[PDB]
Design a protein around this nucleic acid. Sequence first.
RNA 1: CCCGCCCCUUGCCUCUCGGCGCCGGCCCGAAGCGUUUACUUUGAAAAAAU
RNA 2: GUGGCGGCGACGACCCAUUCGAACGUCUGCCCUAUCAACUUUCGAUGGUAGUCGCCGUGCCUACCAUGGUGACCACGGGUGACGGGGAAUCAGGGUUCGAUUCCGGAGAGGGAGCCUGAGAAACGGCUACCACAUCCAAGGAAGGCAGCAGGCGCGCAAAUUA
RNA 3: ACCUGGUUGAUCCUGCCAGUAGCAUAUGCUUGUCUCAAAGAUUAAGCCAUGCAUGUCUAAGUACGCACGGCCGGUACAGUGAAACUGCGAAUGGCUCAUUAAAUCAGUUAUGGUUCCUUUGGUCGCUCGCUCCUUACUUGGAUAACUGUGGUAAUUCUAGAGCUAAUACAUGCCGACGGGCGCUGACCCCCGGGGGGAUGCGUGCAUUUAUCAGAUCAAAACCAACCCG
Lengths: 151, 64, 180, 43, 262
Amino acid sequence: ADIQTERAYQKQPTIFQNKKRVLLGETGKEKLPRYYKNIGLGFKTPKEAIEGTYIDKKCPFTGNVSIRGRILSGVVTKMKMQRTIVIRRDYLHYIRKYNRFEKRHKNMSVHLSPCFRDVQIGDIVTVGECRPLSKTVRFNVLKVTKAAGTK
Amino acid sequence: PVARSWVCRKTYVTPRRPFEKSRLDQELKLIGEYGLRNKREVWRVKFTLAKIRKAARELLTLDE
Amino acid sequence: GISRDNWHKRRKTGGKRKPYHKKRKYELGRPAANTKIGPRRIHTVRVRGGNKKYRALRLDVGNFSWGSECCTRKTRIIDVVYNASNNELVRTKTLVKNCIVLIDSTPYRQWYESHYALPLGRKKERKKNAKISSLLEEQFQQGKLLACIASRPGQCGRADGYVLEGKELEFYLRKIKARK
Amino acid sequence: KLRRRYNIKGRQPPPVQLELEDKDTLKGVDASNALVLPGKKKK
Amino acid sequence: ARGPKKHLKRVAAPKHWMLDKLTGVFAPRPSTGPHKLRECLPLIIFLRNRLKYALTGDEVKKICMQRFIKIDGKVRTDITYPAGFMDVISIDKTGENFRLIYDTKGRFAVHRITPEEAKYKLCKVRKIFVGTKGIPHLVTHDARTIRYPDPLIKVNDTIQIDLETGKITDFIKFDTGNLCMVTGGANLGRIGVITNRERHPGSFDVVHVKDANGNSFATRLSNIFVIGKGNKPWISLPRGKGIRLTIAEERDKRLAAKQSSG
RNA sequence: CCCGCCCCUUGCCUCUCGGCGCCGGCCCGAAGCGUUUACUUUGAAAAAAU
RNA sequence: GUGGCGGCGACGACCCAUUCGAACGUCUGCCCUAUCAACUUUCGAUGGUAGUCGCCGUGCCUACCAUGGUGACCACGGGUGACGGGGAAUCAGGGUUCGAUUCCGGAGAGGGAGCCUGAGAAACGGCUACCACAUCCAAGGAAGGCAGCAGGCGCGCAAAUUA
RNA sequence: ACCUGGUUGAUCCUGCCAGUAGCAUAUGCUUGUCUCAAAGAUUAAGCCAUGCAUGUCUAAGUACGCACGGCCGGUACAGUGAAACUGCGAAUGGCUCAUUAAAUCAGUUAUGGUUCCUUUGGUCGCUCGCUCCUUACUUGGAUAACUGUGGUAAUUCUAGAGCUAAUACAUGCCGACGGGCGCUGACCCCCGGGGGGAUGCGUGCAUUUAUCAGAUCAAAACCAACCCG
Ligand SMILES: [Mg+2]
Ligand SMILES: [Mg+2]
Ligand SMILES: [Mg+2]
Ligand SMILES: [Mg+2]
Ligand SMILES: [Mg+2]
Ligand SMILES: [Mg+2]
Ligand SMILES: [Mg+2]
Ligand SMILES: [Mg+2]
Ligand SMILES: [Mg+2]
Ligand SMILES: [Mg+2]
Ligand SMILES: [Mg+2]
Ligand SMILES: [Mg+2]
Ligand SMILES: [Mg+2]
Ligand SMILES: [Mg+2]
Ligand SMILES: [Mg+2]
Ligand SMILES: [Mg+2]
Ligand SMILES: [Mg+2]
Ligand SMILES: [Mg+2]
Ligand SMILES: [Mg+2]
Ligand SMILES: [Mg+2]
Ligand SMILES: [Mg+2]
Ligand SMILES: [Mg+2]
């Protein structure tokens, strides 16, 4: 749709879009050059990030963030905030006194870039650590894989 | 902070059963034959021998 | 006084926490620079580590860049027209980053006339290309250009920016018109 | 700490006009650090 | 604390200084310098505890203020100067030269070197970058910065530096088959040959080493210092050649010597 | 009943890179994917004092 | 000739790197209480955009937006003769009970707040005001902070040296 | 039948009792020789007389106190040096446990999201460019100590007046000469060598904003057969 939905002009900061040119180049196509980067560690840039038009300064591929630290996994539980979701990580904690285990879980709020679409509740997400993006958000979504049962 | 040492240990233990005729007779025989001063001198040597024999038993619990 | 710490805030779950220490020096905050338009008045602030910040209280000029023509000129500032954060800053004429201002067009017109040898703003190997958008021509007729401030006056002590052009200019013109 | 402690007591006119020099003394002036106070302390 | 600390408790000092417990409450806090606090040997410890030239700290001060001790060819009068790995200490009054090299016990050893060997040192390259006006710069492990290095020199390589001029004479590349010394961890002070290197992106690399007796061990990449090309070291080695010996094989060599005697 | 020597092992379109293919959709080659973990046994890295 | 050249040191200095740090973050781990079952969200609670302030990332704060965020896998509330750890004692083991106390980390300087200088302090053997104490005075004013080392007091009843 | 003894017609259950060793608190009687160590605690992080616990100068920032002093007419300053200015430290150490329950703390990881006195190593030169004619052989204004006049019951309180310093506080350029320093080279002269040269190209950063280039970019060598000249 339209990317200008805020009171300020939404723009990708490193791209200059007011270059004047001959009318021959103007007649052809008004396609802005996109900025994107390779985040490393074998993660591949999604196609829609390169071909898209969304503006997200917190996107790991088209924004100004750096991925460094821990790489984790989780299951998507809630998608109700703007560009950020809540995932859950389950584990077993061992008690030595009784020589047994107990089930525990942790909840994480992670930033979801608009490049990832058709993400549902219950699929596996691989996230990486970045700088604090808000009060509680410190991880940013790197890869999405669908639930095994649901096709 | 000081430049002193706090490392110390006791060298004997008082007997577990205080009224045993056999224990008293053994102490009397040892003190009389070796001219010792009191019971503490016997208990010190008993403590040393107990440590040595406990170490030997613990070593014997292992493979050759 | 002013503190920008985290431990006065509630937890993520919603529960509140009790402090275990008093306020620290490295958590301080300082009153804002409500930079107005007028004769130049700038104060210096000694900051952590022994460095300096230029706290501009009042400014009237800045150098702005005509990006399409690559012409950077120092020009006076006339008025504040639009502010995305709050409309009160427009009413009180406060200079902050990313606010839209009106600047004089005289040095840009002078450079254009001395460069291309064509008239502009007047009432009724490759050659140089002299083409101007109709919106920019109308603004040059009015004598005032719409510009955007890119620096932080309360931190660096100067108000720099660039002349609005293209789709950004159309967006901000539509916003200004809809505000009225 | 709901329990009662021992030390309970220990833990519970226009101003004069000023025309000073150019250098500012107002660097640290606040509510607890007033530039000028009345010469006569309240009894 | 409200600022930097200036004291060091004696029991909290590094264990390889071999300080006793009853001498005093404090230990010499090293000055800031080329080497880190936990991986250095202060001049006072080397001068009164290892060599016994002085009895107290005042005598160390009296020796140093006569400008007798030179570290890497320069006179130092600070008695808490942090001297570290591959440093050269010269005392012309006694005609002695020393090089600080770890022994197999993880401690700096009193290693005397020939005066011709005292003219150079080995340094591990820590950083390569382009400075102002496109001039390449190289930063070593002892905070030496050198301009115009050879383009073939990369990070984790070893260079030989002439102490008088502070210029690179030649270098050893980091490769499998070269000789290396371990400068940290559990295998500190052990000398061997690099066999292979394991790479972990975004993490620490792991390197495998094998010594002359065939024993194998592994360390992190930051704990390895290349010493020689091939099997030949470029510096003299201490009494032990980097082989850490066990009690069983010490008994074996004692039995062999006893059998060969008679 | 040992020991050589050669050959088939199907597939799929979630991601990525492609198409000189058809009406945004579809087809195709792939350069794409085609199990993961717990457990157990190792190896690194992990202040002294006690 | 108001010639031309110079040796060895000291101090100072913009920036880069180094050292000693400091400060914000990541992951996992705490005692009793459910006769505390729902909590947060007006006065920021969760997230988005632009900004202010800050050494910097960030609801840290301010405007405009969405309606979120946590919870029987025990949130939230309450209590603690609760500074945390390395450690001490006792055990066949598992555990249990202690840990103000000479090492490491945190916090405070009678109580709540504020501030100057400085690379570094919200400093108290620094400063300013309030509360509680308290010394000298010619009654106007002035000067204070032993949970540093000694030493005194804490109804009359009592335990280290003003070296 | 999981220590030894007790509570029954017989067998049991539940409440119990005594003996055996330590830890802590308080308190007695005795105490010849010697070595080592310790010393908290009224939920009172309650209150404190007196004294002490943080200062510092090298040949190398500033001496016109005869305060003391050698040599003297060469006489700006021999030398020592109280005071005061300047610089640095006083944010370490020592004490205490009141607050504090994802807080502190412990292990692990990050700085590509910041600051950093010191130490150590780098870096720290000028062509011309209307400032013309004959401060860069060194530019400017002050203030303590000191002299003197004072106020108060009283403090490490200070007021007025008069001198004088800087590595304190400021300002500020490169004096004259030489093809300024480097490359690049048509032609030319001598003896593979020396020269002279038509010419061409260069010759500070730091800050703030905008734009451009950045691995579809630059720089180089190697090259059988087969052509091309
Ligand atoms: Mg301290
Ligand atoms: Mg020191
Ligand atoms: Mg922001
Ligand atoms: Mg926001
Ligand atoms: Mg408490
Ligand atoms: Mg403790
Ligand atoms: Mg404090
Ligand atoms: Mg008190
Ligand atoms: Mg300072
Ligand atoms: Mg305070
Ligand atoms: Mg005090
Ligand atoms: Mg103090
Ligand atoms: Mg005392
Ligand atoms: Mg008493
Ligand atoms: Mg009974
Ligand atoms: Mg000096
Ligand atoms: Mg002073
Ligand atoms: Mg210093
Ligand atoms: Mg200081
Ligand atoms: Mg230096
Ligand atoms: Mg100065
Ligand atoms: Mg210059």
